[PDB]
Amino acid sequence: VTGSGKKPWRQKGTGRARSGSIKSPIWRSGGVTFAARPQDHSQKVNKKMYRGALKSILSELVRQDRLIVVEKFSVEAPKTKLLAQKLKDMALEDVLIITGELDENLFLAARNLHKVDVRDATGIDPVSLIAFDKVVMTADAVKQVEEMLA
Amino acid sequence: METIAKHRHARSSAQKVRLVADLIRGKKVSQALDILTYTNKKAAVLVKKVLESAIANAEHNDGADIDDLKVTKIFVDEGPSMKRIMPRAKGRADRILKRTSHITVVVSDR
């Protein structure tokens, strides 16, 4: 804290309590006792543990019937209208699309559908897998997921 | 009816103004005005002026007939006391409080 080290008064004589720095934590406008720092809240996960949790959550999506696996899933031109129409014929509201190879057409079509996240099988992550109701996965995506989890 | 009149931030202590206000309580406004007229307190000057104000408000905004009036409610509340400083001996500084009060009189047609 911006201050000085002058004892605000003597050690004795006065009627006031002891004090030795205006930057004491006790005082108003003093210094935080255990002042926080920029830390790193990163945790470690054993690669086996990550893969195991992800295989388990894929098993659970399959069991709860939330993984809608399909063949190639695409829009022809970048229109969020076209994409929402596709998902409106597919009876979907909150979806994570995972294609084995992503085209900027569908990516730009799903960029502005906040209830729709398009990804690539290389960049799947459990928080998305659970936060999204219906996870639609192209067949090539499923093959990549297989050959990566294994 | 009940016509109100307030002197807010009255330059005097409530301890004194209410000391004088405890005279004219429930007394008909005539004898109240007279008691205050011959009561020898700055607070008496103050409460008398506020009572005149109440009577005028009653007989201009809310009707008439001074005679049919009583001082039912009168109370004196503390106001924001000014924190001055008064230097005493040996570099020790006091805090003289330029107090004040919130006088309020309510005249009633009963």
């Binding site: 004589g13 006065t14 006031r16 | 570099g91």
Partner: peptide, 14 residues
Amino acid sequence: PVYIPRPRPPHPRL
């Protein structure tokens, strides 16, 4: 009060 008057000496109870 930045000035703090010293206390008067205590009775010499020696």
